[PDB]
Design a protein around this ligand. Structure first.
Ligand SMILES: [Cu+2]
Ligand SMILES: [Cu+2]
Ligand SMILES: [Zn+2]
Ligand SMILES: [Zn+2]
Lengths: 157, 156
């Protein structure tokens, strides 16, 4: 393909929740462009990453159900172990720019991830929108401060 | 490392208004990164572009003083005459990603312009923040719908 469309749903401790739209991913000469067509989100910047597993299912951790835990960690085929954002090749390949949410809860602003070059790199993985933001660092909080997983979609094929 | 710090000031019909912070420009392997440290803006997305002239002063047009008119138009060394945004090399080279302003009126979210590669490409030009947004197209409104010029900073 030259584009793909990822449906995004809210992540619940019990499974999958409300559909909040889709994200269209296209290839550009500068990398992958993520153009959201979403609603249902808190205004501001949200952590936004490709995660390793093609699942948005919840999982148990320290006694409690965690929404979208089965998506696994940030996509990291080079096993860097480091959350350094979309502009640093020393960290997770799955680190995308923060998702920008408008005051009415829609997300429309397009996001360029220059380190990703082909839609093939997304196949068999998941897209994640977090409750918190992303300062592209593991300091002062791990994983950019994204925290909990709010919405999720699977890229199959 | 080599970075530029561009002070940004409100643009008024009578001249230059109050400072609203600065934008730090850095070079990355993927292009220039504009990291804003601004305040005093309306929440939302603002048209954000490099303009040709190293001035932010106002000027008269069709009988009215226009804020920051002296910056000229969008930087366009290839004379494309088209506004197509930061990801499309068929339009103005000066087209940057829209400036993201938080609910409290501050701008902190960093913006990558992949088509710009060296800080030297910004010397002798200006950075412009518009009142309106930017849909990276000349339709439905020309120049992405940025409209009037709200704040501006000279580089060199
Ligand atoms: Cu994530
Ligand atoms: Cu402009
Ligand atoms: Zn990461
Ligand atoms: Zn333009």
């Amino acid at each position: 393909e030259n584009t793909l469309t990822v449906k995004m749903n809210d992540a619940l401790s019990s499974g999958t929740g409300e559909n909040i739209g889709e994200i269209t991913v296209s290839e550009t000469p500068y990398g992958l462009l993520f153009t959201p067509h979403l609603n249902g989100l808190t205004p501001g910047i949200h952590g936004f990453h490709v995660h390793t597993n093609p699942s948005c299912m919840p999982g148990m951790k320290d006694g409690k159900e965690v929404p979208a835990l089965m998506a696994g960690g940030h996509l990291d085929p080079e096993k860097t172990g480091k959350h350094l954002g979309p502009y640093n090749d020393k960290g997770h390949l799955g680190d995308l720019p923060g998702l920008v949410v408008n005051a009415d809860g829609t997300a429309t602003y397009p996001l360029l991830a220059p380190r990703l070059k082909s839609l093939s790199e997304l196949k068999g993985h998941s897209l994640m929108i977090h409750k918190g933001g992303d300062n592209y660092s593991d300091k002062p909080a791990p994983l950019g401060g994204g925290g909990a997983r709010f919405a999720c979609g699977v890229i199959e094929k």
